[PDB]
Design a protein around this ligand. Structure first.
Ligand code: HEM
Ligand SMILES: [K+]
Length: 405
């Protein structure tokens, strides 16, 4: 259950937070993680759960640690330790300076330019998907939109057949929110098994998809290996198969329970981008960490070489020391401060594709289905992990109140 407290960790800084099953999970994931920012919780605590590790609970500690890659390496960014040791995706598991040459190549396949090309296809799928649901007066948001909308776009960018989705979605899920059926190492191996033949095929007959680009690309001049390409594609898959999907559910869940917020975006649609950003703050969902490369005293606390430290990207924006009334959603918030797409040299390369997908969704959905509620009596369940998510979101609505385009 609880790993014995290392001799160097102070007894008074112990807070046994379980990142995969947080005590207040019923109150909502963010609410569950926010218990870390309650009155008597220190800036940095040690939890004996999951092998034991440090956890920065406030924004400036989280931001500072992400900026200092010399002390907080991404070498072992996953918890538990054995998962963080198996974690070898590129560029996610590399620290500057070597990280840069690989990050540039990845930025070329999912970057802004790529997003602009993909826009019209993103809108079609959004509308196509929404219009088909419109008349039914109901849906299971997670499997009827949250998943297919962003995943099909990714599989399109990657040039992978949609039939592989069930298998890939399962693998990435086990990496972020393991249900126990398989370890991170096992899921990685299976993911690599999937990619190997694809990378070599795409490398023989070069296409124009993200995978072909990576497999045939160069890192600051020299040719990328078949292995480096495999570790890079893994990162891209992990990144765009699990993230946007779960976030869309947090947003739509909130919108379903908040008609005043819905009508605001209805009457004033130009504020949608702003709402997108505020929503990304309030419903941030990623939380991974770093490993100490040497003994180091951080904020009056002695950290030992090898110690793992969870730096919850999610907690920064929920930090009342960053945003007043952090748990309150305000589309007009003056300065939306957050680290939802990370901080430092590993800033999310897919943030632009993510924002686009979120904004297009808000627009097209409210345009066709402005009024909708959560199925009556439905107890919504969140799941916690490296990436938190929503188990299911049943939505209902009167078709008579909808409008086709
Ligand atoms: C709501 C959507 C998303 C959120 C909140 C998000 C969040 C994050 C975070 C917090 C990190 C930093 C991890 C660290 O520092 O260890 C990250 C990295 C990354 N994400 Fe995103 N992500 C999202 C969507 C995506 C998508 C759709 C893609 C694929 C197109 C993607 C690709 C990546 C990549 C490749 C990295 C690694 C960057 C590096 O290591 O330099 N992400 N993301
Ligand atoms: K590793």
């Amino acid at each position: 259950n609880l790993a014995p407290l290392p001799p160097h960790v102070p007894e008074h800084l112990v807070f046994d937070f379980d990142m995969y099953n947080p005590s207040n999970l019923s109150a909502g994931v963010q609410e569950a993680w926010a218990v870390l920012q309650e009155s008597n919780v220190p800036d940095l605590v040690w939890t004996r759960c999951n092998g034991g590790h440090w956890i920065a609970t406030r924004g400036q500690l989280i931001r500072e640690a992400y900026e200092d890659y010399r002390h907080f390496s991404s070498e072992c960014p996953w918890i538990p330790r054995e998962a963080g040791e198996a974690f070898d995706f590129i560029p996610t598991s590399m620290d500057p300076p070597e990280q840069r040459q690989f990050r540039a190549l990845a930025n070329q396949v999912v970057g802004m330019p790529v997003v602009d090309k993909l826009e019209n296809r993103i809108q079609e799928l959004a509308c196509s998907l929404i219009e088909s649901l419109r008349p039914q007066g109901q849906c299971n948001f997670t499997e009827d939109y949250a998943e297919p909308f962003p995943i099909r776009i990714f599989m399109l960018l990657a040039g992978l057949p949609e039939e592989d989705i069930p298998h890939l979605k399962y693998l990435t899920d086990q990496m972020t929110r393991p249900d126990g059926s398989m370890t991170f190492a096992e899921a990685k191996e299976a993911l690599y098994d999937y990619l190997i033949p694809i990378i070599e095929q795409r490398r023989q007959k070069p296409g124009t998809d993200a995978i072909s680009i990576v497999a045939n690309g160069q890192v600051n001049g020299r040719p990328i290996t078949s292995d480096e390409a495999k570790r890079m594609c893994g990162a891209l898959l992990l990144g765009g198969l699990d993230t946007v999907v779960n976030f869309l559910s947090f947003s739509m869940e909130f919108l379903a329970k908040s008609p005043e917020h819905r009508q605001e975006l209805i009457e004033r649609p130009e504020r949608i981008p702003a709402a997108c950003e505020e929503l990304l703050r309030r419903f941030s969902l990623v939380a991974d960490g770093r490993i100490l490369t040497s003994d180091y005293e951080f904020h009056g606390v002695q950290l030992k070489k090898g110690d793992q430290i969870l730096l919850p990207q999610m907690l920064s924006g929920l930090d009342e020391r960053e945003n007043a009334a952090p748990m309150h959603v305000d589309f007009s918030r003056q300065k939306v401060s957050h680290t939802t797409f990370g901080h430092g040299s590993h800033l999310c390369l897919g943030q632009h594709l993510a924002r686009r997908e979120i904004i297009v969704t808000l627009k097209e959905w409210l345009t066709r289905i402005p009024d909708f509620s959560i199925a009556p009596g439905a107890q919504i369940q969140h799941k916690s992990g490296i990436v938190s998510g929503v188990q299911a979101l049943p939505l209902v609505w009167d078709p008579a109140t909808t409008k086709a385009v």
